[PDB]
């Protein structure tokens, strides 16, 4: 358990680094936001199982429920960004500086 949380927590940090360090595609930054959901879900699942807290096992499911909605809303926005410039490159989303 000790070794697992450290590896899981560092997994969350790597995805937070991935999310905070953009490249071209906006879709790739969306997949890092799913790397974070997966890390958090696995931590919560292991925590609840290790402590035998069955009443907390609903909570990991809601994380998946409220993580899909973001993935859906994120993908819906990615469609509107593509319908404007023909790609999902972030460097195009810069009109608002002025």
């Amino acid at each position: 358990m000790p070794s697992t949380f450290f590896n899981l927590t560092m997994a969350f940090s790597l995805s937070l680094l991935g999310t905070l360090m953009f490249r071209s595609h906006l879709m790739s930054t969306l997949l890092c936001l799913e790397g974070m959901v997966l890390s958090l879900f696995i931590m919560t699942s292991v925590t609840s199982l290790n402590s035998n807290s069955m009443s907390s096992m609903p909570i990991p499911i809601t994380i998946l429920v409220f993580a899909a909605c973001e993935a859906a809303v994120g993908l819906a926005l990615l469609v509107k960004v593509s319908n404007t410039y023909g790609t999902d490159y972030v460097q195009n989303l810069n009109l608002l500086q002025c």
Partner: protein, 105 residues
């Protein structure tokens, strides 16, 4: 909460599964139910600031049951001291620790 509506209406939307010692399905206690139930009863009514000092005994025990830092430390020391003796050659485990016990029942 910031708007104690649940407390006002007397309902419980999410108040009843806040901690380990809460009710579980089919009356299955959680790990460290005894310790947590002690800590929450110790720190009840005296407030957070008093509880941080006057229920330190209950809390440090619950923290030890939940995370077992001292237990792993202690069992690390016993196994590491035995590793040292066996390399020198001053200790051979018993038969019941080397896979040759007379099993119970």
């Amino acid at each position: 909460p910031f708007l104690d509506i649940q407390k006002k209406l007397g309902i419980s939307l999410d108040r009843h599964f806040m901690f380990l010692s809460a009710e579980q399905p089919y009356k299955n206690a959680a790990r460290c139910h005894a310790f947590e139930k002690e800590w929450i009863e110790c720190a009840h009514g005296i407030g957070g600031t008093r509880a941080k000092k006057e229920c330190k005994i209950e809390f440090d025990d619950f923290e030890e049951c939940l995370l077992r830092y001292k237990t792993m430390r202690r069992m690390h020391d016993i196994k590491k001291q035995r590793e040292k003796l066996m390399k020198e050659g001053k200790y051979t485990p018993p038969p019941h620790h080397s896979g040759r016990e007379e099993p119970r029942p």
